[PDB]
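Consortium newsletter contribution from the modelling node. Members have asked for a concrete example of what our holo predictions look like. Here is one, prepared for the zinc ion complex that several groups have been discussing at recent meetings.
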Amino acid sequence: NDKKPPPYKHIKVNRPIGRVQIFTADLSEIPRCNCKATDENPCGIDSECINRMLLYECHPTVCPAGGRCQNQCFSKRQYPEVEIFRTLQRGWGLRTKTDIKKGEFVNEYVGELIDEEECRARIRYAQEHDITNFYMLTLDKDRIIDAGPKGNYARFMNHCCQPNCETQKWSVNGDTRVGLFALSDIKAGTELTFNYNLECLGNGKTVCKCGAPNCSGFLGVRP
Ligand SMILES: C[S@@+](CC[C@H](N)C(=O)[O-])C[C@H]1O[C@@H](n2cnc3c(N)ncnc32)[C@H](O)[C@@H]1O
Ligand SMILES: Nc1nc2c(O)cc(SSc3cc(O)c4nc(N)sc4c3)cc2s1
Ligand SMILES: *Sc1cc(O)c2nc(N)sc2c1
Ligand SMILES: [Ca+2]
Ligand SMILES: [Ca+2]
Ligand SMILES: [Zn+2]
Ligand SMILES: [Zn+2]
Ligand SMILES: [Zn+2]
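And here is the predicted structure:
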């Protein structure tokens, strides 16, 4: 629902579970860009910042722009203002309260970081309790983000076959994170969606109610 959760279920960074590892970089393995602190928008979405080209967040100890660096989106957790709302046939969803420009950072897909054994146990539990909402995305061959038991606002974004947001996997201080980014200009009040079918995991598949002209008919089917 759209009520404030118990605080322990709202997490701000990914939460490793059980045997799952997270990784850290030596600062010498982190790319350093050529932007200047005096630039109009140092390391911004229109810049030529090499870190952005590599989908690597600038490290705050390293980047020449320092505190003017605009390529620290994941670490700073400054997200466009959003709100949870009830849809007609797709449960709860997420909509922006502010205009968002094409390519802008919308949110990080934050959740519990689990391995495949744990993910199987959670899907089997969902099967036994008739749970029909899933919040799992593949991070890599060993790790899955599950924003179901804990997460942030991104867990409420619904699926669309012709969405207005996309996932991008970035490197942040030596480990991978999933960011959501606008595919186009989005007006305030618009529901935020992405295409689940590239990376999602769940209990089988379910009929898609996105209603897009190109609708492929299902959530849960690799294209
Ligand atoms: C990541 S959650 C999104 C938030 C969810 N609607 C809720 O109320 O908590 C994904 C779940 O939302 C539902 N959903 C999202 N997009 C849908 C769509 N296009 N068609 C049908 N169900 C959808 C499915 O039940 C899916 O398991
Ligand atoms: N009035 C309101 N305040 C808040 C707020 O402060 C934070 C969020 S964000 S995160 C969240 C929300 C859930 O409902 C949830 N449920 C799980 N099982 S995990 C999880 C994570 C939503 C609302 S709505
Ligand atoms: S991969 C996947 C993603 C979902 O959101 C989902 N929801 C269901 N009811 S099955 C399934 C699979
Ligand atoms: Ca360029
Ligand atoms: Ca594997
Ligand atoms: Zn830069
Ligand atoms: Zn920078
Ligand atoms: Zn669809």
